[PDB]
Amino acid sequence: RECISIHVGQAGVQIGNACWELYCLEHGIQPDGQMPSDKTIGDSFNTFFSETGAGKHVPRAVFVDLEPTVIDEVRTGTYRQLFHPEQLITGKEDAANNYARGHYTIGKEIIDLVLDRIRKLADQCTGLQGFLVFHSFGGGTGSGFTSLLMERLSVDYGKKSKLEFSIYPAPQVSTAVVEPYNSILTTHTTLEHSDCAFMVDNEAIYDICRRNLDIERPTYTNLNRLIGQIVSSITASLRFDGALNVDLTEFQTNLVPYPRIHFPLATYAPVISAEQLSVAEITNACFEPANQMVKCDPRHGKYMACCLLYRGDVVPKDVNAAIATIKTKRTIQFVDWCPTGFKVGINYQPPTVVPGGDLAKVQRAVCMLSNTTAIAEAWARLDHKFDLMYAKRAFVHWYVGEGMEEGEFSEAREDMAALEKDYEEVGVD
Amino acid sequence: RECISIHVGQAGVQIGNACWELYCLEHGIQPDGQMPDSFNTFFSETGAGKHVPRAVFVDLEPTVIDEVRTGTYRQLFHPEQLITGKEDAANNYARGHYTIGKEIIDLVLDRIRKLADQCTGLQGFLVFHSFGGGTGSGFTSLLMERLSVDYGKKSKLEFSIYPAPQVSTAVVEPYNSILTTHTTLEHSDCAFMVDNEAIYDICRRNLDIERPTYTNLNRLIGQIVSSITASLRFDGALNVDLTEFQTNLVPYPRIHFPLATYAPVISAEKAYHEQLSVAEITNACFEPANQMVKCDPRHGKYMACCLLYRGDVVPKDVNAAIATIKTKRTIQFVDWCPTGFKVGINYQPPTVVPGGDLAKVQRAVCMLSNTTAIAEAWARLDHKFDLMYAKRAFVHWYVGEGMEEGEFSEAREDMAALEKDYEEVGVD
Amino acid sequence: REIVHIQAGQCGNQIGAKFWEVISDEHGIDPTGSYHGDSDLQLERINVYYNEATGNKYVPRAILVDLEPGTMDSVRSGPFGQIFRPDNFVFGQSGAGNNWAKGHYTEGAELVDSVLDVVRKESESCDCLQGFQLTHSLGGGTGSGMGTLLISKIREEYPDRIMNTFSVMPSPKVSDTVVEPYNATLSVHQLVENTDETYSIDNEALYDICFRTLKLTTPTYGDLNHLVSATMSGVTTCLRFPGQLNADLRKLAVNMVPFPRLHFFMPGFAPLTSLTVPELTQQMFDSKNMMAACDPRHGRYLTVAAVFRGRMSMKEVDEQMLNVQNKNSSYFVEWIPNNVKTAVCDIPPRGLKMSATFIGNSTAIQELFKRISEQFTAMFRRKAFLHWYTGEGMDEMEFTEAESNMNDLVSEYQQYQDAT
Amino acid sequence: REIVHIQAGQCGNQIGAKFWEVISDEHGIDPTGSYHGDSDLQLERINVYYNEATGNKYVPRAILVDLEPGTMDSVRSGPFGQIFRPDNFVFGQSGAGNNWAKGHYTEGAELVDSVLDVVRKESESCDCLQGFQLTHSLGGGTGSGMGTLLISKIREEYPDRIMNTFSVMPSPKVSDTVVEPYNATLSVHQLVENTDETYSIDNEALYDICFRTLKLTTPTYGDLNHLVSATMSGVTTCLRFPGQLNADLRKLAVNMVPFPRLHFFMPGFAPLTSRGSQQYRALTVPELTQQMFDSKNMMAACDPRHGRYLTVAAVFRGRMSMKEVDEQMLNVQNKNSSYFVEWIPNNVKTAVCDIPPRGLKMSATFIGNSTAIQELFKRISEQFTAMFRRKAFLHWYTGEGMDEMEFTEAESNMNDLVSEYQQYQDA
Amino acid sequence: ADMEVIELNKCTSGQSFEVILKPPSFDPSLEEIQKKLEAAEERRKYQEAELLKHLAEKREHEREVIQKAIEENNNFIKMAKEKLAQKMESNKENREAHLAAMLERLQEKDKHAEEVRKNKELK
Numbered sequence A: 001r002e003c004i005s006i007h008v009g010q011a012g013v014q015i016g017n018a019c020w021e022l023y024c025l026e027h028g029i030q031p032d033g034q035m036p037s038d039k040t041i042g043d044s045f046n047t048f049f050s051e052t053g054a055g056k057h058v059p060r061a062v063f064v065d066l067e068p069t070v071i072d073e074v075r076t077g078t079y080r081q082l083f084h085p086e087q088l089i090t091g092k093e094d095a096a097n098n099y100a101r102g103h104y105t106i107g108k109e110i111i112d113l114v115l116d117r118i119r120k121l122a123d124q125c126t127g128l129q130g131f132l133v134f135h136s137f138g139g140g141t142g143s144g145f146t147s148l149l150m151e152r153l154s155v156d157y158g159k160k161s162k163l164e165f166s167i168y169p170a171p172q173v174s175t176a177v178v179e180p181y182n183s184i185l186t187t188h189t190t191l192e193h194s195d196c197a198f199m200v201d202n203e204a205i206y207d208i209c210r211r212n213l214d215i216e217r218p219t220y221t222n223l224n225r226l227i228g229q230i231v232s233s234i235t236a237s238l239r240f241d242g243a244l245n246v247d248l249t250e251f252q253t254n255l256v257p258y259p260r261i262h263f264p265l266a267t268y269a270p271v272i273s274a275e276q277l278s279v280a281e282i283t284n285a286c287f288e289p290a291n292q293m294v295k296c297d298p299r300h301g302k303y304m305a306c307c308l309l310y311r312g313d314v315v316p317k318d319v320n321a322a323i324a325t326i327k328t329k330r331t332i333q334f335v336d337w338c339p340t341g342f343k344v345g346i347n348y349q350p351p352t353v354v355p356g357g358d359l360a361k362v363q364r365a366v367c368m369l370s371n372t373t374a375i376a377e378a379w380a381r382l383d384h385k386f387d388l389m390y391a392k393r394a395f396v397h398w399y400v401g402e403g404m405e406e407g408e409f410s411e412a413r414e415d416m417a418a419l420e421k422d423y424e425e426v427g428v429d
Numbered sequence B: 001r002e003c004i005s006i007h008v009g010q011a012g013v014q015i016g017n018a019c020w021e022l023y024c025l026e027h028g029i030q031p032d033g034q035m036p037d038s039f040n041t042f043f044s045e046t047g048a049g050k051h052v053p054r055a056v057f058v059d060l061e062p063t064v065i066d067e068v069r070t071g072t073y074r075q076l077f078h079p080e081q082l083i084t085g086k087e088d089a090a091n092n093y094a095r096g097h098y099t100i101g102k103e104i105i106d107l108v109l110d111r112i113r114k115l116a117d118q119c120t121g122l123q124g125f126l127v128f129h130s131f132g133g134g135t136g137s138g139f140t141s142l143l144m145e146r147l148s149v150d151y152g153k154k155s156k157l158e159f160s161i162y163p164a165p166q167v168s169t170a171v172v173e174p175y176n177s178i179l180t181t182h183t184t185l186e187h188s189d190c191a192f193m194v195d196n197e198a199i200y201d202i203c204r205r206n207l208d209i210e211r212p213t214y215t216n217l218n219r220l221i222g223q224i225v226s227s228i229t230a231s232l233r234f235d236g237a238l239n240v241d242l243t244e245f246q247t248n249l250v251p252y253p254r255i256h257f258p259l260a261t262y263a264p265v266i267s268a269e270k271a272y273h274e275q276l277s278v279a280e281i282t283n284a285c286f287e288p289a290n291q292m293v294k295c296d297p298r299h300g301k302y303m304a305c306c307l308l309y310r311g312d313v314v315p316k317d318v319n320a321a322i323a324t325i326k327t328k329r330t331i332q333f334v335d336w337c338p339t340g341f342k343v344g345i346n347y348q349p350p351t352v353v354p355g356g357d358l359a360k361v362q363r364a365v366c367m368l369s370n371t372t373a374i375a376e377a378w379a380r381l382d383h384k385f386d387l388m389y390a391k392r393a394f395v396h397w398y399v400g401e402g403m404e405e406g407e408f409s410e411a412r413e414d415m416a417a418l419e420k421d422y423e424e425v426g427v428d
Numbered sequence C: 001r002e003i004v005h006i007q008a009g010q011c012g013n014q015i016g017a018k019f020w021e022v023i024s025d026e027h028g029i030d031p032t033g034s035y036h037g038d039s040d041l042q043l044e045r046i047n048v049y050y051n052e053a054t055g056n057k058y059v060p061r062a063i064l065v066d067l068e069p070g071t072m073d074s075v076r077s078g079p080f081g082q083i084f085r086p087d088n089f090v091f092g093q094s095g096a097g098n099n100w101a102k103g104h105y106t107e108g109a110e111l112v113d114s115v116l117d118v119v120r121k122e123s124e125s126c127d128c129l130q131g132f133q134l135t136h137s138l139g140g141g142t143g144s145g146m147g148t149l150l151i152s153k154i155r156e157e158y159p160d161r162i163m164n165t166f167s168v169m170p171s172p173k174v175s176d177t178v179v180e181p182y183n184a185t186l187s188v189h190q191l192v193e194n195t196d197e198t199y200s201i202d203n204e205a206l207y208d209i210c211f212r213t214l215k216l217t218t219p220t221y222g223d224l225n226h227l228v229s230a231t232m233s234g235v236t237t238c239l240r241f242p243g244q245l246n247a248d249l250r251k252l253a254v255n256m257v258p259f260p261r262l263h264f265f266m267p268g269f270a271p272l273t274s275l276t277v278p279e280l281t282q283q284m285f286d287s288k289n290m291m292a293a294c295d296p297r298h299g300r301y302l303t304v305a306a307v308f309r310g311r312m313s314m315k316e317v318d319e320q321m322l323n324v325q326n327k328n329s330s331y332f333v334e335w336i337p338n339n340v341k342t343a344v345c346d347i348p349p350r351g352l353k354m355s356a357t358f359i360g361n362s363t364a365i366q367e368l369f370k371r372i373s374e375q376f377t378a379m380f381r382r383k384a385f386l387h388w389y390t391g392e393g394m395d396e397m398e399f400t401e402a403e404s405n406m407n408d409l410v411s412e413y414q415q416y417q418d419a420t
Numbered sequence D: 001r002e003i004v005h006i007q008a009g010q011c012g013n014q015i016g017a018k019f020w021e022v023i024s025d026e027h028g029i030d031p032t033g034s035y036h037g038d039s040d041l042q043l044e045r046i047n048v049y050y051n052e053a054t055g056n057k058y059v060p061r062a063i064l065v066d067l068e069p070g071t072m073d074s075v076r077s078g079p080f081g082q083i084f085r086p087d088n089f090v091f092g093q094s095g096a097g098n099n100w101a102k103g104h105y106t107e108g109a110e111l112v113d114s115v116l117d118v119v120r121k122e123s124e125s126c127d128c129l130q131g132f133q134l135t136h137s138l139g140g141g142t143g144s145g146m147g148t149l150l151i152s153k154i155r156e157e158y159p160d161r162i163m164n165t166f167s168v169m170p171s172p173k174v175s176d177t178v179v180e181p182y183n184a185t186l187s188v189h190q191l192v193e194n195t196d197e198t199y200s201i202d203n204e205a206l207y208d209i210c211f212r213t214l215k216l217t218t219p220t221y222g223d224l225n226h227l228v229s230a231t232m233s234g235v236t237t238c239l240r241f242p243g244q245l246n247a248d249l250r251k252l253a254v255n256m257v258p259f260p261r262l263h264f265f266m267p268g269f270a271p272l273t274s275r276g277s278q279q280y281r282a283l284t285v286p287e288l289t290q291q292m293f294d295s296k297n298m299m300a301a302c303d304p305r306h307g308r309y310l311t312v313a314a315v316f317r318g319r320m321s322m323k324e325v326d327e328q329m330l331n332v333q334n335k336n337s338s339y340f341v342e343w344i345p346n347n348v349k350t351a352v353c354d355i356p357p358r359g360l361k362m363s364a365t366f367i368g369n370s371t372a373i374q375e376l377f378k379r380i381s382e383q384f385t386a387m388f389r390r391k392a393f394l395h396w397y398t399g400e401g402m403d404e405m406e407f408t409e410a411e412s413n414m415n416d417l418v419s420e421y422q423q424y425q426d427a
Numbered sequence E: 001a002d003m004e005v006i007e008l009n010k011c012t013s014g015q016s017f018e019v020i021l022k023p024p025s026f027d028p029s030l031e032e033i034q035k036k037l038e039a040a041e042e043r044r045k046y047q048e049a050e051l052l053k054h055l056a057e058k059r060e061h062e063r064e065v066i067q068k069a070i071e072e073n074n075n076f077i078k079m080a081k082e083k084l085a086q087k088m089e090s091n092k093e094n095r096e097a098h099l100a101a102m103l104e105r106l107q108e109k110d111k112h113a114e115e116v117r118k119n120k121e122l123k
């Protein structure tokens, strides 16, 4: 039924602002909150917004960061009118690029408040589904508050599932060396409190724009427009009411065969720059390491569940024979023990792009959600940095500093080692 | 003296209704019961106007008994004499005997005792019922065990409807027949089987009927039965009383089953051809085609033979006709009983149902033979039974309602042994 | 004598909807009111499928169960919408999950008792309730899980009366959920011990009937329901029409089932979509026209019923009927003797002058079970998507406990290719 | 979020002065009043370095400590004189001595509590105080001694917030006092346990940049302060300017420091000179990068050769294409790939702010954790124990109330810090 | 064959007679069974009241699943309610005396500085 977004952390927040924005274009809401369509009192898009008061259309979201700065630039540029001054929690002092600070030291204090301001939004909902947690993998509040949130959300909310969108961190447009530590830290405390988790590899997004958009050295608000589009094609199912993927379970009951293995690989279809493609051709893109969403290589790992999420003008009569010659040309690549997939999700709502943005209006777009075993490639490409540093206690002392334990590091690498193991342990028979 | 009809089960009831109808035409009763000793043998002179049949009608659904309290004749019976019972027997004996039976039997049994009580010296009962099929096999069986107890000497004549693939619906049929026929046979005296297939046959050849109805078949059986019972309704020498029925036909306790053959079945539309000769109709009785149970008595031995004549006939004719039934056709007698032919004349011309299928005939004949070839149908049944039980086939529905894996065993056993007596009567 | 209908699940319900409006046409009923039609038969056996209420009016004997609003307000908003009595609708609110357990255990038993509550007050009103029939999917929870629950709870209360379902066995091609094999095997088990007849309906068939046999590219859940809707009318007819049978539903079962397990009639139909007798008969006896995905060749017919529809000469019918049993004599069992009876009712359906329906207890149905159990153990393998039930409160071995019950049912059907 | 500034000592103060007036220009502040400039950015992050008072006005968050009047009335009488709030001036009256003890023990602690009194004010006024920074000499008491004290007392009060100093390592060549080695070692010890980052600035360098790389004959304390003033603007910028970082000062340290000792960024600069010498615009990016990565342009007197970079930041200034920047940046890491450590992965990040400094179209600042810093420490300790030998000038501290072994106690703390840097040429 | 008949009766509306042709040439019901009809009911009542004690079976196993789940669920909440605030009050005690451990070294380059002025003012 209902559906709450949490965005913690500078990265979370700005991905958020850049897709609440794109939600807003899609459903036709003028910034001030009011939409001139016959679809409010308080079905269909009520999944995400709440028809509060007699005029406006507030997002069911809560925004948290530990500096102001970022949350501040929401109560600034129009959209300022869109939320409730309540729903944006800021916290005075930074997390400083450090998990321990985020979880234990600076966290402690703000968590009680957030947790409860969330409970306000769950209370204006008759049968709430779950949460969408947007947050940065590496980096301070994003790894460390997010981790604490989930532990707590997990307690305060029963079944109510939790979907995370993590931002897997990339040397080129980062600033923080200590990154890896933070990701392998959170990811450990975090994973037994999560249900399905879309990783988004900054590098791969930086990649798409440098190749497919002709952008020289792309901005954050460059990257975010792109992610904004992808997320909104994932969440698309539950917003217009979809012919498939129409609830959080039978959306993901689809994707995750095993409790641990959350991490699906996304692939967005026609990224093409303003200043059109065939139903066949865009499908035949989803399987192209370039157009990928996490830098890896799925042609060599096995697929173990595959979704195709179509959006736009499409008759299934096309989709089919297109797939047909995905199998008689390219690399099939299936696991020992699960059918040969392809849940196929048609949504007739044509894809809208941000007005003076980078991309153009497309007729049809595709979205492929694959749970391949090759996405653990980035599980090590991380690990290895973490390994090669901790090996020297490298930056450790900043953690033990704020209050942490030499061994809680040990213990988290332990988890990845073991995970990296399950992902390997799913190949053949 | 007196004489009570029981008709259990859809088949029973409709044969019944189609021969109480034909009794009625014969004795000239307008439906309402009023007609403007002798025939008191079947009806009772109740009240001052009407002429109620001495019958009881039982079925386990309403449906069929319901038809009676509907189409004129509605006036003919007593609301009491038609027992209905809410839920079906569902094509299954166990249900008929043990489960659904139990409940109604005490009532019927006693409603019969009402009719026997308005009778000074009752003779016996005529039980009309379907061989295969549910209440017909199952209730009939339970009735007889009980009628056997509640009534001393008082004999019991059954008219069974031996079941035929073409106009049936039920697969489980064989089991039910071989079931009842077992419990049933030591409580019965003489029993006229009626092979549905043979009757379906007569109509397809002799009446020109394409695919004949039930009420097609019943008009025909109605005529045959009414030629058998004839003896005791007008009172004409030979079969004046039910005891004679066995005395003439059944030499052995078990062997009840006589074979009937009705004479001139001919269709109105032919109603004005120069009608058949005393000779020719006799010479029909001995024709596997005009038979009443599908078999072949030319190759089994006869062991008692009756000819029941009805109509305009002087005996001088009958005789020399028979004479050349011998010197032409197949004699075929058993080692040790005269050479038969107890011959029954009844001067009452045979009446047919008005807008019926057959025509008014001058003379008709009826031949009741106790041949050992009629056990051909005792096996043609058996074999199906055998070839099913062999796999427990449908059994579980029975063990279900309450029955015993072995009560089946034990009933085939009886047939096996009967089939044996019937063979054991040839030559020496 | 009188039958109630339970119609549970998105697949179960949108079937139930189409069923009802097609039979409601044959009898001729206004989207609300009563009779409008020059025929006069209809109403004889309308007693059976419609409990009638005040004014003119006729209202079905139907209960609609779902575990979410969505598909219920589809019916009420669609074709024969406001025909069903307002509070015969049992709402769901919650999740369904496309998961058996939620529907049989948690969110199901959560409702259930409210369903029993409508059924109890239709059936208790019903003057001689003969039995219930149910419609529903087999891969996916609200139908397969709740309904298999429903039926277990429907017996026990009503041992007594005979149960009956059109269930839709799911295929790998043309489905939504990775898991369905799990969902199916769990209810298959349930059915095989609690129903008295179960019309098997493959969507592998239903869809195949459309693209090999109909030149329809993009097969909806529409024109595909259309078949089931038709085939269902077919099977019912003679409890709801003539008077040339009389069809106790019990009788009907007794004469259709040899062995108490194995009541798995694969059906089939005559003509198709939106007819001579011969060319009708060697058409309801072609596999390329069966409702399960089998092939009534590898596998011999236990018992077989057909019902014919059209003011035509049945003097032709038994003559063609015979002919099939001899042109194809091998493929009926010998040990049940007159094991293929047919009958005919003469009031045709929507469109179509002449039509036929084939009910069929063929051991070739083993061919369907085996197909599911094949992709089932292929998944129960390294115990895959199972963790969605692990957590729901189901047992590790409880899957294996019903995987086995099925591999019996396989090699009993195999064990009935026997001997004279 | 907000930073205060303590500026103590003749060398610390006259650095402080030049700092202030150079950053005060970038933002554009009247020798007293407020803003005058067509730019509009400036003021975003003026919050940080300037606590603002009534009227228009903007006044620095500054404290000036000295142990004698002399050099305080130099500022107030000089360039941006009356800019600092009148009683943020902490006078001295007494001796300074050019002696560590007087400053850290006797005449220092004599004052100290009055300094803590201004600092406690500003910082207690300051709405989210992030940390302090300090400027001062290392050979010579009032700066090196008082400040090392200040910091020790600054902490304890402020554990909590992050500390930070530009300190001026003294050379044997171009200095006043025979003893400075003594003074240095004593503070070095102090620093290495109490600061969080500490920009090393050799006057061996500073003077060497002037005659090696300028042809500048008579090097003042003037043109030479000039460098430090510039380099200090360099380093500060991105807590005080764009919005393309965001530079927590903490974050800033966490990402810059591996091992909690060793916070010894030797720095460096892009361009140079002041008077009768130019640049023909030619500051190019390539020729800017292989310039802030040349030793002959480091702020400590090391040579970031013998010794490998732990972590390295740079910040670039000028409306230029950074699409060039990362490409040159890369290039240096490969043209000189050897001399970075492998075991911290992405250990050289750089960013760019586009509002240039006084003069100069294009310029670069190098912040720089090189273990070649070991090169500097070792240089002092070499003339220290060469003096603590037959315990020479020591008697100036003997008598002040300092212990015989207390010199050796901090001579050692230094020789650890030598061979820890040596112990980080690892694997 | 030409035979002679034996006249066996004459009445109002008929006449009977044998016609022998070629001479012959010589060669316990029990009532007690009504207790049989309630042995049949012996086994029915056994069956139906067994697919009840096998059905009221598959019942309070449902009781399990339905709750032996919920019982195994909050068995996680009150596993992760202290895997928290006692992993986390381990943190509070942890740091807070790495503050002390920071500070108490201060009182010691402090109560050292004190004593060597009380030593200066004695030199």
Ligand SMILES: Nc1nc2c(ncn2[C@@H]2O[C@H](COP(=O)(O)OP(=O)(O)OP(=O)(O)O)[C@@H](O)[C@H]2O)c(=O)[nH]1
Pocket: A008, A009, A010, A011, A012, A014, A015, A065, A066, A067, A094, A095, A096, A097, A098, A136, A137, A138, A139, A140, A141, A142, A143, A167, A168, A169, A170, A173, A174, A175, A202, A220, A221, A223, A224
């Ligand atoms: N894709 C993407 N990544 C971002 C964005 N902004 C920051 N990041 C990344 O965020 C990661 C670190 O998390 P941050 O949100 O920046 O840090 P935080 O501690 O959670 O938030 P603050 O410390 O208060 O600013 C790094 O990998 C950055 O590259 C953004 O807008 N888009």
Ligand SMILES: Nc1nc2c(ncn2[C@@H]2O[C@H](COP(=O)(O)OP(=O)(O)OP(=O)(O)O)[C@@H](O)[C@H]2O)c(=O)[nH]1
Pocket: B008, B009, B010, B011, B012, B014, B015, B059, B060, B061, B088, B089, B090, B091, B130, B131, B132, B133, B134, B135, B136, B137, B161, B162, B163, B164, B167, B168, B169, B170, B196, B214, B215, B217, B218
């Ligand atoms: N001759 C004749 N045979 C019939 C008639 N009706 C049914 N039968 C046969 O009887 C057998 C089934 O017997 P039923 O009388 O229908 O069974 P029942 O239990 O007595 O009747 P129900 O109450 O309907 O179950 C089949 O062989 C039918 O062909 C009929 O009207 N006339």
Ligand SMILES: Nc1nc2c(ncn2[C@@H]2O[C@H](COP(=O)(O)OP(=O)(O)O)[C@@H](O)[C@H]2O)c(=O)[nH]1
Pocket: C008, C009, C010, C011, C012, C014, C015, C096, C098, C099, C137, C138, C139, C140, C141, C142, C143, C144, C168, C170, C171, C174, C175, C176, C180, C203, C206, C221, C224, C225
């Ligand atoms: N033909 C028919 N089958 C359907 C329909 N909808 C779903 N199915 C099939 O039934 C299975 C699951 O049924 P579903 O309705 O999703 O489950 P439920 O709502 O929980 O009962 C899937 O394999 C589908 O292929 C439909 O309405 N008609």
Ligand SMILES: Nc1nc2c(ncn2[C@@H]2O[C@H](COP(=O)(O)OP(=O)(O)O)[C@@H](O)[C@H]2O)c(=O)[nH]1
Pocket: D008, D009, D010, D011, D012, D014, D015, D096, D097, D098, D099, D137, D138, D139, D140, D141, D142, D143, D144, D168, D170, D171, D174, D175, D176, D177, D180, D203, D206, D221, D222, D224, D225, D228
């Ligand atoms: N560049 C910079 N260094 C200086 C300056 N003045 C002195 N120095 C060097 O730094 C040392 C310490 O400064 P000094 O004023 O003597 O220390 P004080 O006792 O705090 O006043 C001196 O001995 C010089 O070697 C200054 O003008 N700027």
Ligand SMILES: C/C(Nc1ccccc1)=C1/C(=O)N[C@@H](Cc2ccccc2)C1=O
Pocket: B169, C133, C164, C165, C197, C235, C236, C237, C238, C239, C247, C249, C252, C253, C256, C305, C306, C307, C341, C342, C343, C359
């Ligand atoms: C056996 C049979 N019909 C039949 C009976 C005798 C001869 C020919 C066909 C049927 C039938 O017509 N319908 C099903 C009963 C049924 C089952 C479910 C829903 C409606 C009706 C049956 O078993």
Ligand SMILES: C/C(Nc1ccccc1)=C1/C(=O)N[C@@H](Cc2ccccc2)C1=O
Pocket: A175, D133, D164, D197, D235, D236, D238, D239, D245, D247, D249, D251, D252, D253, D255, D256, D313, D314, D315, D349, D350, D351, D367
């Ligand atoms: C980490 C860092 N800069 C930096 C930050 C992100 C990306 C690149 C360089 C700096 C810097 O520019 N200056 C010092 C901070 C500083 C130094 C002295 C006085 C005040 C503030 C530092 O840590």
Ligand SMILES: [Mg+2]
Pocket: A066, A094, A095, A096, A097, A098, A139, A140, A141, A142
């Ligand atoms: Mg942070």
Ligand SMILES: [Mg+2]
Pocket: C010, C098
């Ligand atoms: Mg569904």
